[PDB]
Ligand SMILES: NC(=O)C1=CN([C@@H]2O[C@H](COP(=O)(O)OP(=O)(O)OC[C@H]3O[C@@H](n4cnc5c(N)ncnc54)[C@H](O)[C@@H]3O)[C@@H](O)[C@H]2O)C=CC1
Ligand SMILES: NC(=O)C1=CN([C@@H]2O[C@H](COP(=O)(O)OP(=O)(O)OC[C@H]3O[C@@H](n4cnc5c(N)ncnc54)[C@H](O)[C@@H]3O)[C@@H](O)[C@H]2O)C=CC1
Ligand SMILES: N[C@@H](Cc1ccccc1)C(=O)O
Ligand SMILES: N[C@@H](Cc1ccccc1)C(=O)O
């Protein structure tokens with residue numbers, strides 16, 4: 001309900017409703033402790049407004065931890081645009097109006113929130129926001145931004161994956177079966193990187209053309225209905241979050257979970273179940289941080305493309321630290337990553 | 350209602366929950382067309398969060414219209430702090446924390462919203478907010494603000510009442526019976542002004558002592574349960590809003606409605622009923638603007654106290670304009686005041 005969604009502990013919630021387009025807007029700032037809150041804009045259809053608020057809150061909390069654990073001097077926030085219809089069907093006029101409105105909202109926060117792309121938003125959209133507000137990462141190269149962060153995210157997830165498989169004792173990825181759920185911007189790149197390292201890929205996507213392309217490349221399609229029941233060495237969720245529910249955690253047939261999606265774990269019990277079953281999960285907020293490293297590194301810290309690459313690869317080392325903590329203290333990898341995030345943040349202050 | 354809580358059409362809603370004190374915070378910015386949004390901080394207990402969101406939006410929209418119609422260069426907003434218990438029951442430490450959090454919220458808006466006092470907040474509270482954020486009107490004179498704006502609001506309401514009584518054909522307040530609902534900062538002052546003008550005062554308040562005092566000052570008390578059906582020439586709502594529902598509009602026994610309360614009319618329908626029954630209503634957002642005039646005038650425009658008083662007196666002329674549109678166009682006073690506000694704002 002709205003009441004439960006409003007019982008959230010973050011720093012601020014910004015909302016707006018635009019009767020003309022019928023769109024609802026949410027900006028959640030989980031924390032501004034390390035710096036202004038930063039996070040992308042997701043646009044999707046939600047069943048109830050409450051869902052958009054809850055997703056924004058979980059996404060914003062993930063950004064706070066992602067920044068902290070990755071030694072990025074930013075807080076965490078997220079924007080969710082609850083669409084009046086499927087993205088597909090939204091006309092250009094309506095989408096342009098929605099973006100102008102979102103930009104006005106960001107603008108009022110005057111630098112306390114910096115946006116970027118997320119699901120259903122791109123660099124062209126970031127250039128549009130930027131026509132109205134300064135606080136946007138991810139603009140096109142021509143507009144002064146760093147462009148797509150997808151590739152860097154993939155590199156980071158792939159390095160997360162290699163470090164995870166290694167710590168789990170499976171050796172290298174050559175020969176291992178990897179199931180990639182979601183062949184999007186990040187997923188498609190991750191599939192190619194894993195393939196080049198010798199993995200056998202199993203893939204799934206609601207978009208049939210994407211699947212056909214992967215199959216043309218030698219991969220094996222998996223029916224959507226069987227994704228969570230398919231045996232594999234590594235399950236790589238690269239679509240939406242909330243995939244690993246307590247029920248799915250009890251029956252997942254794999255040894256490692258390492259993907260790009262945000263908020264992979266639907267509930268705490270699910271995290272405790274994977275840990276107890278010996279399935280090594282590389283925490284989402286650590287593993288998928290290459291996108292933030294690329295945007296913040298490039299646009300805020302002035303790092304070179306080379307250095308961003310290096311920091312993304314370093315996600316493997318961060319995870320080795322997380323696993324180290326998990327093994328020594330007897331806690332799940334998610335809890336150990338939160339601990340590490342806290343240590344890093346403190347150090348960074 | 351759900352629609353007023355969630356499907357509100359204003360520019361921005363800010364919410365926050367603080368588990369430690371149990372308080373919910375709402376800031377609604379209805380419009381920043383004419384300048385930064387400005388409006389006070391109301392702190393009260395609400396049955397449901399939807400009621401706090403609904404009220405914040407209605408109060409913020411009233412602020413936009415008040416600024417527009419009063420020729421003040423600001424937009425409209427409002428803050429509502431939904432308390433975990435009665436204001437009087439909150440401890441000092443809890444209150445202090447609630448104010449600090451509210452100031453951090455205002456601060457993130459960086460000048461797009463300017464607050465001030467409202468129900469349950471005062472100048473000392475503004476000073477506390479100002480220890481953390483710059484965007485505060487109504488700080489004490491010692492801290493650099495304009496102090497209390499209540500007397501100015503009373504003067505504006507009194508002039509609004511004079512203009513309304515005259516337009517209604519009653520001549521002057523001399524020899525009229527005025528029922529003041531709410532003997533607070535504004536109400537007590539209004540009553541004193543009206544009595545001085547020769548009106549006989551009927552008064553009501555939930556505070557037993559306030560009534561006894563008015564009674565001592567020569568007035569006549571009305572029991573709470575009789576307030577809404579007590580015959581009077583003028584009904585002056587100076588307590589809470591939402592007083593005039595359709596049913597109340599059908600049974601009020603008076604010829605003029607002119608008071609200080611914000612959002613007096615509960616439903617559009619009530620406005621038509623008053624009009625049809627020959628009860629002339631002075632729109633709240635025009636009538637009670639003296640406080641805004643005082644704070645914006647003093648604090649943003651540098652006006653002195655005498656100029657502010659004069660501008661508050663001019664609310665009577667603004668209402669004469671509203672009545673002229675009402676009579677000429679055949680619309681209620683509220684619709685007419687909305688039309689005048691849009692004209693003065695050079696397009697809604
Ligand atoms: N792009 C980036 O830099 C970063 C993205 N992430 C997260 O990674 C995830 C993927 O992001 P992107 O690749 O950029 O998004 P995207 O929009 O390019 O691709 C998502 C892909 O998932 C597919 N998909 C959707 N629902 C599916 C389902 N039920 N089963 C299978 N496939 C399905 C979509 O058709 C699409 O191919 C999202 O959670 C995103 O928030 C996290 C960190 C950084
Ligand atoms: N103070 C100002 O400058 C301005 C105030 N207003 C509005 O004027 C109204 C009164 O404001 P203030 O005098 O400042 O507040 P106040 O808190 O000083 O006084 C309100 C009075 O109403 C009495 N009361 C409460 N509920 C009652 C009820 N049901 N029946 C009878 N009496 C009741 C209280 O006992 C108190 O004496 C509010 O709606 C306020 O928002 C609007 C414009 C400016
Ligand atoms: N949306 C991406 C990348 C991003 C990082 C920082 C700011 C904006 C966008 C993520 O979930 O990490
Ligand atoms: N709270 C008052 C006055 C106020 C005006 C402007 C800013 C802040 C407070 C009202 O209802 O008008």
Ligand SMILES: [K+]
Nearest residue numbers: 117118120121
């Ligand atoms: K995208």
Ligand SMILES: [K+]
Nearest residue numbers: 137138139145
């Ligand atoms: K940019």
Ligand SMILES: [K+]
Nearest residue numbers: 466467469470
């Ligand atoms: K007050």
Ligand SMILES: [K+]
Nearest residue numbers: 519520521523
């Ligand atoms: K008279």
Ligand code: NA
Nearest residue numbers: 359360379380
């Ligand atoms: Na508006």
Ligand code: NA
Nearest residue numbers: 549550567568
């Ligand atoms: Na009297």
